[PDB]
Amino acid sequence: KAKVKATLGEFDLRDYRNVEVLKRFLSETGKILPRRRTGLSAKEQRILAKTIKRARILGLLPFTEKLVRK
Amino acid sequence: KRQVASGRAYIHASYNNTIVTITDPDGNPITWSSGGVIGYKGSRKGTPYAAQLAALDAAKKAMAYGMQSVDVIVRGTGAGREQAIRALQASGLQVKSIVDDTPVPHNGCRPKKKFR
Amino acid sequence: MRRYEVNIVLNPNLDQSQLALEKEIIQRALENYGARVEKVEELGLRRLAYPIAKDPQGYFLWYQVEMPEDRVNDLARELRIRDNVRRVMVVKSQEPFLANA
Amino acid sequence: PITKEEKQKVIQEFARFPGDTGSTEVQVALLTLRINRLSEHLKVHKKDHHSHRGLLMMVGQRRRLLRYLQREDPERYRALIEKLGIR
RNA sequence: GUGGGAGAGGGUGGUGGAAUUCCCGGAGUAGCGGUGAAAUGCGCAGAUACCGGGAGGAACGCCGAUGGCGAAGGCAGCCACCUGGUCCACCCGUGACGCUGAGGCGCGAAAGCGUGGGGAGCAAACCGGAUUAGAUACCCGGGUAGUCCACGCCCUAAACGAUGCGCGCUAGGUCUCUGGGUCUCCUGGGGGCCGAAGCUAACGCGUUAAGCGCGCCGCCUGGGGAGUACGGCCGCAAGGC
Ligand SMILES: [Mg+2]
Ligand SMILES: [Mg+2]
Ligand SMILES: [Mg+2]
Ligand SMILES: [Mg+2]
Ligand SMILES: [Mg+2]
Ligand SMILES: [Mg+2]
Ligand SMILES: [Mg+2]
Ligand SMILES: [Mg+2]
Ligand SMILES: [Mg+2]
Ligand SMILES: [Mg+2]
Ligand SMILES: [Mg+2]
Ligand SMILES: [Mg+2]
Ligand SMILES: [Mg+2]
Ligand SMILES: [Mg+2]
Ligand SMILES: [Mg+2]
Ligand SMILES: [Mg+2]
Ligand SMILES: [Mg+2]
Ligand SMILES: [Mg+2]
Ligand SMILES: [Mg+2]
Ligand SMILES: [Mg+2]
Ligand SMILES: [Mg+2]
Ligand SMILES: [Mg+2]
Ligand SMILES: [Mg+2]
Ligand SMILES: [Mg+2]
Ligand SMILES: [Mg+2]
Ligand SMILES: [Mg+2]
Ligand SMILES: [Mg+2]
Ligand SMILES: [Mg+2]
Ligand SMILES: [Mg+2]
Ligand SMILES: [Mg+2]
Ligand SMILES: [Mg+2]
Ligand SMILES: [Mg+2]
Ligand SMILES: [Mg+2]
Ligand SMILES: [Mg+2]
Ligand SMILES: [Mg+2]
């Protein structure tokens, strides 16, 4: 399986406004993805988290979702 | 005395019971059921069988209102949390979609002693 | 005077007399708190991920600024007191840390 | 807080000669500046304990560089002290 | 000094969503809850389940780690401001300015105390239901102090690495956080795991020493009696030294 950053451009980890990309590090549900699946370094992930949570308070990213099938 | 066509069907499962409410596409219920609604009383209510029959009884009771397409919402976990969706599938209701909506806090409330 | 970024998300449904009004009021705020305005991006109509003030959408603003520090908080208070402004997020500017460089 | 403008203005104020960054004088100047900042910050905020410890420390340093200075040249010490308003 | 950096380090103000409880409304019957089984309890004055709206308190899911910061206690949503500690590079400045530290002073989880707020969930005491030979307990249903905040006391702890601080010296290997570099790799600085020499009663410790040394502080001297008594000091008290 692909890790996110493996398929991706050279992109701001610090942009909370760009949803197109930030969406890719969310799960099927609103959950921020483990490093296992984001292929991100330690620092990187740590920044990514904070930029997500920002974006979330801005209504751009989902705080939580609902799971389909089941 | 509604004739509701398509509709939502929620399944709330616990370790103590299952209940199913069936409802209209804007959210108001139509009929419901539960392990205690049909025969069972004690612990017996949270068996998966009881979950089945609750599912069914509510779904036939929905036939009476004229239900056909149903969208499923599921909340909780218990035995026959699944068995209810199994019955509900082959019930004679065409299942639109299943969903798991189980509510979880972002960690706000102290739990009871049984829960930590 | 430091460099910040003001995000404003306000009620979508506005018409023109209205929208130009709240925008000029935001302006009168920034002038009044000593905020030089380096750039603006008006994104506008956008689909929110979750309903905000009963409404599925929002209208989007972004302002780069240089303003004195001890004001930024009060400036944000006054920016919020407006009814139609549903979120204000002010953020200290940062440089762009990249990835997959 | 303390920016390079302010910082420098003080170091060029207390240097023993042009170019000196680390003279005893300049260290006690800069110290004493930071000290004053912080004790103003705890004029409010009496509940900030960790900063307070920091200040006990800062103070400790200042006092040591003075103790030294006075041992070495008493005169330049009296200078430093009146100039800074201390002890 | 300069120039970079990482961080739940502290303080102050704002603010976001999830969830619980409650209240208003809709639709909707006969149960819900709960347990090994049950019963108290709640429900026809309409509950549970479902939808929409409001109010209020507390705590911050995923990220999250075997991670980070802090002198310790301890510290996790986001934002801003106020502030502490620390690390690397540059080799620029002072020129031994150092280490430790009896007393003192300050910090010090939780519970607890005082005065005034607050009160959702939880919950000592308490009230009930069970279980049992009995149940004063566990298990179930309620519930007050408390938990929360402001200010002032209290000063304990398995306050644990059960390992005082500082410095120098003594194979490596492996995982890792964070700097710098000519970036299979080197080189600082933290976190772990194996293991040289050595140590150790053993277990184990082993460049994060329990090894080889030096400095300084604390402490120990069979068990019970006993952290008791008397005395002093602190404390509103509880009680502490
Ligand atoms: Mg039951
Ligand atoms: Mg508003
Ligand atoms: Mg912090
Ligand atoms: Mg803080
Ligand atoms: Mg009602
Ligand atoms: Mg009754
Ligand atoms: Mg009754
Ligand atoms: Mg209330
Ligand atoms: Mg975790
Ligand atoms: Mg800092
Ligand atoms: Mg030199
Ligand atoms: Mg010389
Ligand atoms: Mg002492
Ligand atoms: Mg205490
Ligand atoms: Mg307490
Ligand atoms: Mg009290
Ligand atoms: Mg309770
Ligand atoms: Mg009894
Ligand atoms: Mg109880
Ligand atoms: Mg020793
Ligand atoms: Mg590197
Ligand atoms: Mg440490
Ligand atoms: Mg190391
Ligand atoms: Mg190692
Ligand atoms: Mg050996
Ligand atoms: Mg070992
Ligand atoms: Mg050593
Ligand atoms: Mg030993
Ligand atoms: Mg003793
Ligand atoms: Mg004896
Ligand atoms: Mg005692
Ligand atoms: Mg005596
Ligand atoms: Mg006494
Ligand atoms: Mg007395
Ligand atoms: Mg006692």
Curated annotation (Swiss-Prot), chain A:
The stretch of the full-length protein covered here is: 19 to 88 of 88
Q: How does it assemble?
A: Part of the 30S ribosomal subunit. Forms a tight heterodimer with protein bS6, also interacts with protein uS11. Binds to the C-terminus of IF3 and to the central section of Era.
Q: Which domain of life is it from?
A: Bacteria
The source organism is Thermus thermophilus (strain ATCC 27634 / DSM 579 / HB8)
- Report the coiled-coil segments: none
Q: Which family does it belong to?
A: Belongs to the bacterial ribosomal protein bS18 family.
Per the record, GO CC terms?
ribonucleoprotein complex; ribosome
GO BP term, pick one: translation
* Known role: Located on the back of the platform of the 30S subunit where it stabilizes the close packing of several RNA helices of the 16S rRNA. Forms part of the Shine-Dalgarno cleft in the 70S ribosome, where it probably interacts with the Shine-Dalgarno helix.
This protein is called Small ribosomal subunit protein bS18
Q: Which UniProt keywords apply?
A: Ribonucleoprotein, Ribosomal protein, RNA-binding, rRNA-binding
Q: Signal among the record's keywords?
A: no
GO MF terms listed in the record are: small ribosomal subunit rRNA binding; structural constituent of ribosome
Curated annotation (Swiss-Prot), chain B:
Answer yes or no on keyword Nucleotidyltransferase.
no
The Gene Ontology CC terms held by the record are:
ribonucleoprotein complex; ribosome
Q: Where is the composition biased (Basic residues)?
A: 109-116
Keywords (alphabetical) are: Ribonucleoprotein, Ribosomal protein, RNA-binding, rRNA-binding
Disordered: region residues = 99-116
| GO MF annotation terms | rRNA binding; structural constituent of ribosome
GO BP annotations of the record are: translation
Q: Which InterPro entries match?
A: Ribosomal_uS11, Ribosomal_uS11_bac-type, Ribosomal_uS11_CS, Ribosomal_uS11_sf
Tree of life domain:
Bacteria
Pfam families in the record? Ribosomal_S11 (PF00411)
Protein family membership: Belongs to the universal ribosomal protein uS11 family.
Q: What does this protein do?
A: Located on the upper part of the platform of the 30S subunit, where it bridges several disparate RNA helices of the 16S rRNA. Forms part of the Shine-Dalgarno cleft in the 70S ribosome, where it interacts both with the Shine-Dalgarno helix and mRNA.
The record, for HAMAP family, names: Ribosomal_uS11
Subunit structure, interactors included? Part of the 30S ribosomal subunit. Interacts with proteins S7 and S18. Binds to the C-terminus of IF-3; however exactly how IF-3 interacts with the 30S subunit is unclear. May contact the C-terminus of Era.
Instruction: Indicate what this protein is called per its UniProt record.
Output: Small ribosomal subunit protein uS11
The gene name reads: rpsK
UniProtKB/Swiss-Prot annotation, chain C:
User: Which GO molecular function, any one, fits this protein according to its record?
Assistant: structural constituent of ribosome
Q: Which GO terms describe its cellular component?
A: cytoplasm; ribonucleoprotein complex; ribosome
Keyword Iron-sulfur among record annotations: no
Task: Fetch the Gene3D superfamilies from UniProt.
Answer: 3.30.70.60
- Its domain of life reads Bacteria
Record bears the keyword Ribosomal protein = yes
Task: Report any one BP term from Gene Ontology.
Answer: translation
Keywords associated with the record: Ribonucleoprotein, Ribosomal protein, RNA-binding, rRNA-binding
Q: Known InterPro entries for this protein?
A: Ribosomal_bS6, Ribosomal_bS6_CS, Ribosomal_bS6_sf, Ribosomal_S6_plastid/chlpt, Transl_elong_EF1B/ribsomal_bS6
Query: What biological function has been recorded for the protein in this entry?
Result: Located on the outer edge of the platform on the body of the 30S subunit.
**NCBIfam families assigned to the protein according to its UniProt record, in alphabetical order:** S6
Q: Which PANTHER family match?
A: MITOCHONDRIAL 28S RIBOSOMAL PROTEIN S6, SMALL RIBOSOMAL SUBUNIT PROTEIN BS6M
Quaternary organization: Part of the 30S ribosomal subunit. Forms a tight heterodimer with protein bS18. May make transient contacts with protein uL2 of the 50S subunit during translation.
| Family indicated by similarity | Belongs to the bacterial ribosomal protein bS6 family.
List, alphabetically, the HAMAP family matched. Ribosomal_bS6
**Know the name of this protein?**
Small ribosomal subunit protein bS6
Organism of provenance: Thermus thermophilus (strain ATCC 27634 / DSM 579 / HB8)
The organism's taxonomy opens as: Bacteria, Thermotogati, Deinococcota, Deinococci, Thermales
From Swiss-Prot, chain D:
Give the InterPro entries listed for this entry. Answer: Ribosomal_uS15 (IPR000589), Ribosomal_uS15_bac-type (IPR005290), uS15_NS1_RNA-bd_sf (IPR009068)
Q: Could you confirm whether the keyword Membrane appears in this record?
A: no
Instruction: Give the GO biological process terms.
Output: translation
Q: Which SMART domains does this entry report, sorted A to Z? A: Ribosomal_S15 (SM01387)
Q: Which UniProt keywords apply?
A: Ribonucleoprotein, Ribosomal protein, RNA-binding, rRNA-binding
| A Gene Ontology molecular function term of the record | structural constituent of ribosome
Q: Which Gene3D superfamilies match?
A: 6.10.250.3130, S15/NS1, RNA-binding
Keyword Ribonucleoprotein applies: yes
For this protein, the record's NCBIfam families field holds: S15_bact (TIGR00952)
Q: Family assignment? A: Belongs to the universal ribosomal protein uS15 family.
Which HAMAP family does the record cross-reference, listed alphabetically?
A: Ribosomal_uS15_B
**Role description:** One of the primary rRNA binding proteins, it binds directly to 16S rRNA where it helps nucleate assembly of the platform of the 30S subunit by binding and bridging several RNA helices of the 16S rRNA. Forms an intersubunit bridge (bridge B4) with the 23S rRNA of the 50S subunit in the ribosome.
- What is this protein's name? Small ribosomal subunit protein uS15
What are the leading ranks of the lineage?
Bacteria, Thermotogati, Deinococcota, Deinococci, Thermales
Q: Give the encoding gene's name.
A: rpsO
